[PDB]
Amino acid sequence: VKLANPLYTEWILEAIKKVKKQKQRPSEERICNAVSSSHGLDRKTVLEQLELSVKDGTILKVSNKGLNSYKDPDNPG
């Protein structure tokens, strides 16, 4: 019903917004860097929480023909 850590989900949604503000695609690596830089969470954990949040439906995973990216439901474009 909600597997992801709710606060970690919040940190990731913050990272997505920041990475987009930096005019970059919000891919796995760039989200990990942003969450690390803002909150000190380790990359391995951010990747698990990104996966879990996608299953919860609180973060959208978009399949691009190149690199996949992730979106806030509140700003799905």
Partner DNA sequence: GGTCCGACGGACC
Partner DNA sequence: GGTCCGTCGGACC
Residues at the site binding a copy of itself, with contacts judged by CB under 8 A: 27-30, 32-33, 36, 43, 66-67
Helix (H, G, I), strand (E, B) or coil at 67: coil
Nearest to a copy of itself of 17, 43 (CB atom): 43
How far is the first Cα of the chain from the last one, in angstroms, to the nearest whole number?
26
Report the residue from 22, 55, 57, 73 that binds DNA according to the rule CB under 7 A: 22
Helix (H, G, I), strand (E, B) or coil at 62: strand
Region from 7-15, 18-26, 41-49, 52-60 binding DNA, contact rule CB under 7 A: 18-26
DSSP state at residue 58: S
Picked from a copy of itself, DNA, none, the partner binding residue 77 (CB below 5 to 8 A depending on kind) is DNA
- Which residue shows structure tokens 């399949």? 63
**Token pair listed for 8:** 């970690």
Binding residues vs DNA (CB under 7 A): 20, 22-26, 33, 37, 64, 66-67, 69, 77
